[PDB]
Amino acid sequence: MFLIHFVHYKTILQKYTFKFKHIFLSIDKYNSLFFNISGILIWLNIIHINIILIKYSFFILINNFEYLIILIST
Amino acid sequence: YYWSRYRMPTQMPKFDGPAPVAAPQSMNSTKTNEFIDPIDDKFPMSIRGP
């Protein structure tokens, strides 16, 4: 039987906060140092030189993977 | 892939245009170094220094 009619209180208080980072926030990426390329030399069958900026080059990279390439002041 | 590392991160500079100022370009008989800077070696040691 029913004796009464009432209004339904509830305590919805969130007072605690637990947020956990999903895994992919910590995954790696590939980051690189970046300087302005002053020049480039490519050689595979035939050598080719491109010069963007002529200055005394303070750093030089050599990379052999497919074609021989030399990145000047890179 | 293990190779996914060796991709280019940035777009590499295109070759749009002609050989640079005082480039080595070789006529009928010319002894040409790609290596030696044409303009900065010709410039007197007296001035530029050793």
PDB file of C-alpha atoms in Angstrom:
ATOM      1  CA  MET A   1       0.000   0.000   0.000  1.00  0.00           C
ATOM      2  CA  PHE A   2       1.061   3.662  -0.261  1.00  0.00           C
ATOM      3  CA  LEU A   3       1.040   6.040   2.668  1.00  0.00           C
ATOM      4  CA  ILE A   4       2.955   8.900   1.224  1.00  0.00           C
ATOM      5  CA  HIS A   5       4.246  10.975  -1.661  1.00  0.00           C
ATOM      6  CA  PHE A   6       7.819  12.241  -1.663  1.00  0.00           C
ATOM      7  CA  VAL A   7      10.343  14.255  -3.645  1.00  0.00           C
ATOM      8  CA  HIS A   8      13.532  12.144  -4.160  1.00  0.00           C
ATOM      9  CA  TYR A   9      16.707  13.645  -2.747  1.00  0.00           C
ATOM     10  CA  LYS A  10      20.041  12.430  -4.136  1.00  0.00           C
ATOM     11  CA  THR A  11      23.609  13.520  -3.362  1.00  0.00           C
ATOM     12  CA  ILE A  12      25.315  13.945  -6.759  1.00  0.00           C
ATOM     13  CA  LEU A  13      28.421  15.593  -5.360  1.00  0.00           C
ATOM     14  CA  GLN A  14      31.542  14.896  -7.463  1.00  0.00           C
ATOM     15  CA  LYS A  15      33.900  16.142  -4.791  1.00  0.00           C
ATOM     16  CA  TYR A  16      36.700  13.764  -5.856  1.00  0.00           C
ATOM     17  CA  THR A  17      38.472  13.935  -9.230  1.00  0.00           C
ATOM     18  CA  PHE A  18      40.297  10.989 -10.808  1.00  0.00           C
ATOM     19  CA  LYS A  19      41.566  11.532 -14.345  1.00  0.00           C
ATOM     20  CA  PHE A  20      43.984   9.022 -15.784  1.00  0.00           C
ATOM     21  CA  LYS A  21      46.012   9.719 -18.901  1.00  0.00           C
ATOM     22  CA  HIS A  22      45.270   7.340 -21.757  1.00  0.00           C
ATOM     23  CA  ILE A  23      48.325   5.390 -22.913  1.00  0.00           C
ATOM     24  CA  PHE A  24      48.986   7.255 -26.181  1.00  0.00           C
ATOM     25  CA  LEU A  25      49.906  10.483 -24.399  1.00  0.00           C
ATOM     26  CA  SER A  26      53.308   8.928 -23.586  1.00  0.00           C
ATOM     27  CA  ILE A  27      54.034   7.184 -26.928  1.00  0.00           C
ATOM     28  CA  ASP A  28      57.186   8.220 -28.825  1.00  0.00           C
ATOM     29  CA  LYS A  29      57.527  10.420 -31.817  1.00  0.00           C
ATOM     30  CA  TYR A  30      60.538  11.311 -33.924  1.00  0.00           C
ATOM     31  CA  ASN A  31      61.839  14.777 -33.141  1.00  0.00           C
ATOM     32  CA  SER A  32      64.634  16.533 -34.887  1.00  0.00           C
ATOM     33  CA  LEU A  33      67.023  19.436 -34.515  1.00  0.00           C
ATOM     34  CA  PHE A  34      66.401  21.905 -37.338  1.00  0.00           C
ATOM     35  CA  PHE A  35      68.826  24.364 -38.928  1.00  0.00           C
ATOM     36  CA  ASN A  36      68.613  26.282 -42.203  1.00  0.00           C
ATOM     37  CA  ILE A  37      70.087  24.231 -45.046  1.00  0.00           C
ATOM     38  CA  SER A  38      72.753  26.219 -46.834  1.00  0.00           C
ATOM     39  CA  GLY A  39      73.438  23.585 -49.507  1.00  0.00           C
ATOM     40  CA  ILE A  40      72.984  20.019 -50.776  1.00  0.00           C
ATOM     41  CA  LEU A  41      75.052  17.538 -52.754  1.00  0.00           C
ATOM     42  CA  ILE A  42      73.477  14.425 -54.226  1.00  0.00           C
ATOM     43  CA  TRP A  43      75.298  11.614 -55.988  1.00  0.00           C
ATOM     44  CA  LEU A  44      74.029   8.263 -57.224  1.00  0.00           C
ATOM     45  CA  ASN A  45      74.641   7.823 -60.970  1.00  0.00           C
ATOM     46  CA  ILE A  46      75.622  11.434 -61.566  1.00  0.00           C
ATOM     47  CA  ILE A  47      76.566  14.156 -59.109  1.00  0.00           C
ATOM     48  CA  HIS A  48      74.321  17.178 -58.641  1.00  0.00           C
ATOM     49  CA  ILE A  49      74.915  20.253 -56.492  1.00  0.00           C
ATOM     50  CA  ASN A  50      72.429  22.727 -55.185  1.00  0.00           C
ATOM     51  CA  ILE A  51      73.563  25.822 -53.333  1.00  0.00           C
ATOM     52  CA  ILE A  52      70.903  27.801 -51.477  1.00  0.00           C
ATOM     53  CA  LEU A  53      73.141  30.119 -49.489  1.00  0.00           C
ATOM     54  CA  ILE A  54      76.889  30.578 -49.718  1.00  0.00           C
ATOM     55  CA  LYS A  55      78.466  31.013 -46.313  1.00  0.00           C
ATOM     56  CA  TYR A  56      81.223  29.356 -44.358  1.00  0.00           C
ATOM     57  CA  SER A  57      79.536  26.098 -43.339  1.00  0.00           C
ATOM     58  CA  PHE A  58      79.702  25.356 -39.622  1.00  0.00           C
ATOM     59  CA  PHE A  59      78.225  21.840 -39.774  1.00  0.00           C
ATOM     60  CA  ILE A  60      78.060  18.994 -42.328  1.00  0.00           C
ATOM     61  CA  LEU A  61      75.918  15.850 -42.645  1.00  0.00           C
ATOM     62  CA  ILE A  62      76.549  12.751 -44.702  1.00  0.00           C
ATOM     63  CA  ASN A  63      73.868  10.228 -45.340  1.00  0.00           C
ATOM     64  CA  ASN A  64      74.307   7.049 -47.377  1.00  0.00           C
ATOM     65  CA  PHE A  65      71.013   5.214 -47.447  1.00  0.00           C
ATOM     66  CA  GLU A  66      69.822   5.186 -51.065  1.00  0.00           C
ATOM     67  CA  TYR A  67      71.704   7.933 -52.766  1.00  0.00           C
ATOM     68  CA  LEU A  68      74.837   9.524 -51.286  1.00  0.00           C
ATOM     69  CA  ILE A  69      73.720  12.882 -49.945  1.00  0.00           C
ATOM     70  CA  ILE A  70      75.614  15.640 -48.186  1.00  0.00           C
ATOM     71  CA  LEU A  71      73.620  18.330 -46.386  1.00  0.00           C
ATOM     72  CA  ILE A  72      75.804  21.447 -45.990  1.00  0.00           C
ATOM     73  CA  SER A  73      75.383  23.718 -42.913  1.00  0.00           C
ATOM     74  CA  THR A  74      72.227  21.696 -42.529  1.00  0.00           C
TER      75      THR A  74
ATOM     76  CA  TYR B   1      58.345  -0.625 -40.236  1.00  0.00           C
ATOM     77  CA  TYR B   2      61.877  -0.328 -38.999  1.00  0.00           C
ATOM     78  CA  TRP B   3      62.363   1.774 -42.078  1.00  0.00           C
ATOM     79  CA  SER B   4      59.571   4.173 -41.155  1.00  0.00           C
ATOM     80  CA  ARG B   5      62.373   6.092 -39.444  1.00  0.00           C
ATOM     81  CA  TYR B   6      64.179   6.963 -42.651  1.00  0.00           C
ATOM     82  CA  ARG B   7      61.347   8.994 -44.196  1.00  0.00           C
ATOM     83  CA  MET B   8      61.816  12.745 -44.871  1.00  0.00           C
ATOM     84  CA  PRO B   9      60.292  14.864 -42.082  1.00  0.00           C
ATOM     85  CA  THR B  10      60.387  18.093 -44.151  1.00  0.00           C
ATOM     86  CA  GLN B  11      59.966  18.893 -47.853  1.00  0.00           C
ATOM     87  CA  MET B  12      63.449  19.131 -49.393  1.00  0.00           C
ATOM     88  CA  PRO B  13      64.445  22.248 -51.360  1.00  0.00           C
ATOM     89  CA  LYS B  14      63.664  21.990 -55.067  1.00  0.00           C
ATOM     90  CA  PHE B  15      66.135  22.849 -57.763  1.00  0.00           C
ATOM     91  CA  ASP B  16      64.268  25.706 -59.424  1.00  0.00           C
ATOM     92  CA  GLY B  17      66.971  27.642 -61.147  1.00  0.00           C
ATOM     93  CA  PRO B  18      70.394  28.150 -62.697  1.00  0.00           C
ATOM     94  CA  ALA B  19      73.982  27.602 -61.525  1.00  0.00           C
ATOM     95  CA  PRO B  20      75.200  30.039 -58.794  1.00  0.00           C
ATOM     96  CA  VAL B  21      77.346  33.158 -59.386  1.00  0.00           C
ATOM     97  CA  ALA B  22      80.759  32.274 -60.859  1.00  0.00           C
ATOM     98  CA  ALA B  23      79.923  28.555 -61.023  1.00  0.00           C
ATOM     99  CA  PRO B  24      82.751  26.210 -62.316  1.00  0.00           C
ATOM    100  CA  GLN B  25      81.171  25.624 -65.767  1.00  0.00           C
ATOM    101  CA  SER B  26      83.639  23.958 -68.108  1.00  0.00           C
ATOM    102  CA  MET B  27      84.392  24.921 -71.702  1.00  0.00           C
ATOM    103  CA  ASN B  28      86.644  23.177 -74.267  1.00  0.00           C
ATOM    104  CA  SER B  29      89.563  22.482 -71.928  1.00  0.00           C
ATOM    105  CA  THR B  30      89.107  23.546 -68.315  1.00  0.00           C
ATOM    106  CA  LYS B  31      90.524  22.070 -65.118  1.00  0.00           C
ATOM    107  CA  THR B  32      87.592  22.366 -62.768  1.00  0.00           C
ATOM    108  CA  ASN B  33      87.227  21.765 -59.055  1.00  0.00           C
ATOM    109  CA  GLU B  34      83.662  21.519 -57.833  1.00  0.00           C
ATOM    110  CA  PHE B  35      85.309  21.774 -54.466  1.00  0.00           C
ATOM    111  CA  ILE B  36      87.221  25.029 -54.509  1.00  0.00           C
ATOM    112  CA  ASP B  37      85.182  28.196 -54.138  1.00  0.00           C
ATOM    113  CA  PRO B  38      85.913  30.192 -57.332  1.00  0.00           C
ATOM    114  CA  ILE B  39      85.469  33.672 -55.820  1.00  0.00           C
ATOM    115  CA  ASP B  40      86.939  33.272 -52.330  1.00  0.00           C
ATOM    116  CA  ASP B  41      90.193  31.639 -53.360  1.00  0.00           C
ATOM    117  CA  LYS B  42      90.863  34.071 -56.190  1.00  0.00           C
ATOM    118  CA  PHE B  43      90.664  36.804 -53.472  1.00  0.00           C
ATOM    119  CA  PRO B  44      94.276  37.780 -52.492  1.00  0.00           C
ATOM    120  CA  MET B  45      95.923  36.210 -49.419  1.00  0.00           C
ATOM    121  CA  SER B  46      97.372  39.607 -48.657  1.00  0.00           C
ATOM    122  CA  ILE B  47      93.830  40.838 -48.010  1.00  0.00           C
ATOM    123  CA  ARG B  48      91.929  37.843 -46.721  1.00  0.00           C
ATOM    124  CA  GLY B  49      94.828  36.216 -44.836  1.00  0.00           C
ATOM    125  CA  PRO B  50      96.066  32.573 -44.680  1.00  0.00           C
TER     126      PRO B  50
END
